[PDB]
Enzyme design. Structure first.
Site, PDB file in Angstrom:
ATOM      1  N   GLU A   1      26.498 -35.932  62.493  1.00  0.00           N
ATOM      2  CA  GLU A   1      26.023 -35.676  61.176  1.00  0.00           C
ATOM      3  C   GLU A   1      27.160 -35.808  60.196  1.00  0.00           C
ATOM      4  O   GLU A   1      28.296 -35.456  60.513  1.00  0.00           O
ATOM      5  CB  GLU A   1      25.463 -34.266  61.118  1.00  0.00           C
ATOM      6  CG  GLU A   1      25.008 -33.850  59.723  1.00  0.00           C
ATOM      7  CD  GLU A   1      24.095 -32.639  59.760  1.00  0.00           C
ATOM      8  OE1 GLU A   1      23.976 -32.033  60.854  1.00  0.00           O
ATOM      9  OE2 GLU A   1      23.488 -32.303  58.713  1.00  0.00           O
TER      10      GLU A   1
ATOM     11  N   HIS B   1      24.400 -24.492  56.510  1.00  0.00           N
ATOM     12  CA  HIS B   1      23.730 -25.786  56.667  1.00  0.00           C
ATOM     13  C   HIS B   1      23.804 -26.232  58.143  1.00  0.00           C
ATOM     14  O   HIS B   1      22.792 -26.540  58.782  1.00  0.00           O
ATOM     15  CB  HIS B   1      24.375 -26.828  55.734  1.00  0.00           C
ATOM     16  CG  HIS B   1      24.003 -28.255  56.041  1.00  0.00           C
ATOM     17  ND1 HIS B   1      22.816 -28.824  55.631  1.00  0.00           N
ATOM     18  CD2 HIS B   1      24.675 -29.229  56.705  1.00  0.00           C
ATOM     19  CE1 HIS B   1      22.775 -30.083  56.030  1.00  0.00           C
ATOM     20  NE2 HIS B   1      23.888 -30.352  56.683  1.00  0.00           N
TER      21      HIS B   1
END
Ligand SMILES: CC(=O)N[C@H]1[C@H]([C@H](O)[C@H](O)CO)O[C@@](OC[C@H]2O[C@@H](O)[C@H](O)[C@@H](O)[C@H]2O)(C(=O)O)C[C@@H]1O
Ligand SMILES: CC(=O)N[C@H]1[C@H]([C@H](O)[C@H](O)CO)O[C@@](OC[C@H]2O[C@@H](O)[C@H](O)[C@@H](O)[C@H]2O)(C(=O)O)C[C@@H]1O
Lengths: 196, 196, 110, 224, 98, 110
Positions: D128, D34
């Site tokens: 993030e 990811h």
């Protein structure tokens, strides 16, 4: 399969502290072992109870006979003299565009003052290797541009068609299961494109 | 509080129409307003009733009472006489390694034939400004190498220790709250290697 | 050309081009199209052509060349000091870019 | 300290968001994949992660730029020239794990050769935060609509609030999410260009209301 | 030298090779409906000419960035033969060249 | 200096850097730190510094930079030939690199 450095590739005087001089490199065991011309050159010139350093081992010559004792990488750098092979062989062939399609560049190699090389694969198996250098070579000019493309295909993992000139043979790689020549062109191609 | 361009850097040959000649930059008012001596130098050099362009405002000739009248960026360029200053100060301080760690690169600035620069910032607070030009500078040959990395640390959010010499003080930045010096070297932070 | 130096602001370089300096062979032009962030497609500052010279004799990349490239890929707002001189990118004239600073914020870039 | 609130730019509107939240494209809960874009890659999307960022500023700039893209489109004659963006305020509980920690951790568990440098450089730049599985209506406490008329230069801000928002005192989980070693052959960190943005974050924001150009961060991290 | 401009095209093929003493590079710029635009650039003979390197890099970054471009290729003297590239422009990342 | 050339395997460069060559202004270093896989932080091989020379007279990038960059960006492991010289970087001694080669497998990187 190992490509065996031709006899003449060898330096007259081996080198100290394991520091094979510039543009040259440590000779290997599996390479000396395969070289008849070499073992003979050696024994025909090794005096006393002398032992020598090989990239991966030792060479007991002179009174010891001419024995190739196995070893560890850099291990024999302990000694006084490491046998060095030169890497640049002037093949003296024709400047012909030998090309290898569908290859992918890998295993980069660099050394002080010498060339930058890559082992171009296909299905994991090698195919050819090429190099570029700004200091030594017929295509010193081409280095600047070549490094650029080389870098891209490399990190990008870009598949290409590489072009070499066999006029120069290189022994930069240790125990070369493949040849190694002068890089001449790299092409991010379209199958059958006239651009390859 | 901002950093003030020392009188000396006042170009006796003022730029024309906001076109400060190369390597020189439009003096701001916050600066002229702060440099007493410069002001003072002005009262004695400004002939009666002359108007002068700056980055911010305008400076009226002593006949008008000699004033630093504010104004918007490059508004005063409408007038011929523009107050410019050379961006390089030969500090006199000795050539030596000074460095700040855990900073990031930001605020790229570039004149025409002068330095490329950056503001290294630590946790929000701007820490120092460094510059590198392949045209002038005690290190003008290290530009090409440095510029390349200056750039990498710039796109990547990479933190670094930056080495700077104080033998040259750079004023390319208008109204700064940090000092600018010559970039000597960068070193990616590495805690384990004990760098940052 | 223009009579004085314009100073755009909150400009992002939106496009780059490399072209030969039709007049001089030792040089070529690095041209771009800056455009004031947000401004209506109608606004005057919504399409500003610029170029700067690059000497083809010296090796490497001029500082402006490195910034232009860095701020382009990152689309960072600048403070272009444009003109007074003008070249001709895209047939239409374009002003020479002579300095550029990234915008810190509303303070230096309104 | 872990964050309490994160942001998430999205092109889906409040009537949709406030009532359904966000849900991850898939079950691959592999951090590296990811973090490097592999699990969000076009036709390879399956990350069990909902991208967020503890930096509103960050989100603001992405939008600020996405908007400009519109103007530049209409300029060429592609777009109508209008824009509508959303920035959702999210209560980050202990189900949101940091991309940083998680990356740096998967590395100091598998080996420096096991993780690509830029991909971590990138996780830091995006602050993030990985909402594992799904992020429910209950956490979405607000939104900021951004209309822009690039034709007339009109930007209109308007903040609506979720009723279903449940308030509780929470913070993102401090303990990094731990994955098993990847098996995938990652080439590099896919990231969207100008400005640089994580292929997940940048790609999960799009929905149905063209192909996104994803590039390998490394291919250009160093100039040519 | 009937020059042409091709906008909003992508670089599909990039390749550097030798052409006699000099070396050259070429690109296939392509637009879905339309055909292929093949343009090359070679050693200007005059040495110092950063041009080749510069133009080459530029082209690589265009290739790299996956962006649309605007090329102004001069004209090919004999069919089949790619035209000589004289201008390169990288269209706004994510958008198109107006 | 060090006595003889050391040959470390399975190294990955984790930092990278530049500085000047204290001997002359015609050269400069390009240091970096390498780590050996498996090696615990107690191990000295988990933090091996180095550097090489770069001639500031020959403009452009050395094959060793070009590689370093590539193998760094990519976290490629490597066989490195360092020694016998030590150079100073970050105020400490660091083994001059004379040649490196990417690791293919245990067969050459044990
Ligand atoms: C010097 C030389 O012989 N070059 C050949 C090249 C090499 O033999 C090849 O790169 C290594 O196998 O082969 C070329 O043809 C490729 C082509 O070969 C057919 O035999 C095969 O059936 C096809 O699938 C395809 O691989 C090449 O460029 O790769 C021709 C070249 O002249
Ligand atoms: C010129 C100089 O003073 N360099 C110092 C530097 C500066 O003082 C620093 O940039 C100021 O912020 O400090 C260096 O150490 C790192 C940092 O470590 C902290 O724990 C400490 O509290 C700070 O004062 C500072 O020392 C640095 O490189 O930043 C060392 C350097 O000599």
């Amino acid at each position: 399969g190992i490509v065996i450095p031709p006899q003449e590739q060898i330096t007259q005087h081996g080198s100290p502290y394991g520091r094979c001089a510039n543009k040259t490199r440590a000779l290997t065991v599996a390479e000396l072992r395969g070289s008849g011309d070499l073992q003979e050159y050696l024994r025909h010139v090794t005096r006393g109870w002398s032992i020598f350093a090989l990239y991966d081992g030792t060479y007991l010559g002179g009174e010891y006979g001419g024995v190739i004792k196995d070893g560890t990488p850099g291990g024999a750098f302990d000694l006084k003299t490491t046998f060095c092979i030169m890497t640049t062989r002037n093949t003296g062939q024709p400047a012909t565009d030998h090309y290898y399609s569908n290859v992918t560049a890998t295993r980069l190699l660099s050394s002080t003052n010498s060339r930058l090389c890559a082992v171009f694969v296909r299905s994991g198996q090698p195919v050819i290797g090429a190099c570029t250098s700004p200091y030594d070579g017929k295509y010193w000019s081409m280095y600047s541009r070549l490094r650029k493309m080389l870098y891209l295909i490399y990190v990008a993992g870009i598949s290409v068609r590489v072009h070499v000139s066999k006029e120069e043979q290189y022994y930069d790689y240790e125990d070369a299961t493949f040849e190694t020549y002068a890089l001449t062109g790299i092409s991010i191609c379209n199958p059958g494109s006239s651009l390859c | 509080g901002i950093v003030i361009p020392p009188k000396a850097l006042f170009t006796q040959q003022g730029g024309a129409y906001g076109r400060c000649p190369n390597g020189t930059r439009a003096l701001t008012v916050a600066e002229l307003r702060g440099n007493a001596e410069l002001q003072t130098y002005l009262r004695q050099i400004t002939p009666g009733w002359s108007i002068y362009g700056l980055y911010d405002g305008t400076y009226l000739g002593q006949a008008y009472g000699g004033i630093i009248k504010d104004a918007p960026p490059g508004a005063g360029f409408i007038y011929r006489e523009t107050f410019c200053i050379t961006t390089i100060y030969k500090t006199g301080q000795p050539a030596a390694d000074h460095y700040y760690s855990k900073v990031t690169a930001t605020r790229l600035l570039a004149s025409t034939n002068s330095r490329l620069c950056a503001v290294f910032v630590r946790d929000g607070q701007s820490v120092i400004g460094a510059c590198a030009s392949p045209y002038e500078g005690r290190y003008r040959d290290m530009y090409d190498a440095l510029r390349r990395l200056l750039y990498m640390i710039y796109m990547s959010g990479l933190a670094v220790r930056v080495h700077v010499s104080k033998e040259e003080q750079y004023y390319d930045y208008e109204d700064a709250t940090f000092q600018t010096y010559a970039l000597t070297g960068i070193s990616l932070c590495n805690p384990a290697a004990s760098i940052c | 050309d223009v009579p004085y130096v314009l100073v755009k602001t909150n400009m992002v370089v939106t496009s780059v081009a490399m072209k030969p300096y039709e007049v001089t062979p030792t040089r070529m032009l690095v041209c771009g199209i800056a455009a004031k962030l947000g401004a209506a497609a109608s606004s005057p500052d919504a399409h500003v052509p610029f170029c700067f010279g690059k000497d083809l004799k010296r090796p490497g990349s001029s500082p402006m060349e490195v910034m232009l490239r860095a701020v382009f890929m990152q689309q960072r707002p600048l403070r272009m000091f444009l003109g007074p001189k003008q070249l001709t990118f895209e047939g239409k004239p374009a002003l020479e870019l002579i300095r550029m600073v990234e915008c810190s914020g509303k303070q230096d870039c309104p | 300290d872990p964050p309490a609130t994160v942001y998430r730019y999205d092109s889906r509107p409040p009537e949709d968001v406030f009532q359904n939240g966000f849900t991850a494209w898939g079950n691959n809960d592999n951090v590296l994949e990811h973090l490097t874009g592999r699990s969000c890659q076009v036709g390879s999307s399956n990350s069990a992660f909902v991208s967020t960022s503890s930096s509103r500023r960050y989100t603001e700039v992405y939008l600020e730029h996405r908007m400009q893209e519109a103007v530049e489109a209409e300029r060429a004659g592609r777009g109508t020239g209008h824009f509508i963006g959303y920035i959702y305020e999210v209560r980050a509980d202990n189900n949101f794990y940091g991309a940083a920690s998680s990356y740096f951790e998967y590395v100091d568990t598998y080996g420096d050769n096991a993780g690509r440098i830029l991909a971590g450089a990138l996780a830091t730049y995006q602050s993030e935060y990985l909402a594992h599985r799904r992020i429910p209506p209950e956490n979405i406490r607000r939104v900021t609509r951004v209309y822009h008329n690039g034709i007339t230069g009109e930007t209109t801000t308007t903040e609506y609030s979720n009723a279903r928002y449940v308030s509780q005192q929470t913070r993102a989980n401090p303990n990094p999410y731990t994955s098993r070693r990847s098996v995938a052959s990652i080439v590099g960190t896919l990231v969207r260009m100008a400005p640089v943005v994580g292929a997940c974050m940048a790609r999960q924001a799009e929905s149905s209301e063209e192909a996104m150009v994803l590039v390998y961060y490394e291919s250009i991290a160093y100039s040519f | 030298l009937p020059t042409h401009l091709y906008k909003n095209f992508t670089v599909q093929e990039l390749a550097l090779k030798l052409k006699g003493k000099n070396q050259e590079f070429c690109l296939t710029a392509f637009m879905s409906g339309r055909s292929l635009v093949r343009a090359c650039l070679s050693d200007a003979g005059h040495e110092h000419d950063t041009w080749f390197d510069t133009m080459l890099g530029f082209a690589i970054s265009a290739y790299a960035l996956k962006s649309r471009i605007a090329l102004t290729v001069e004209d090919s003297p004999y069919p089949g033969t790619p035209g000589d590239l004289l201008e390169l422009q990288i269209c706004p990342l994510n958008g198109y060249c107006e």
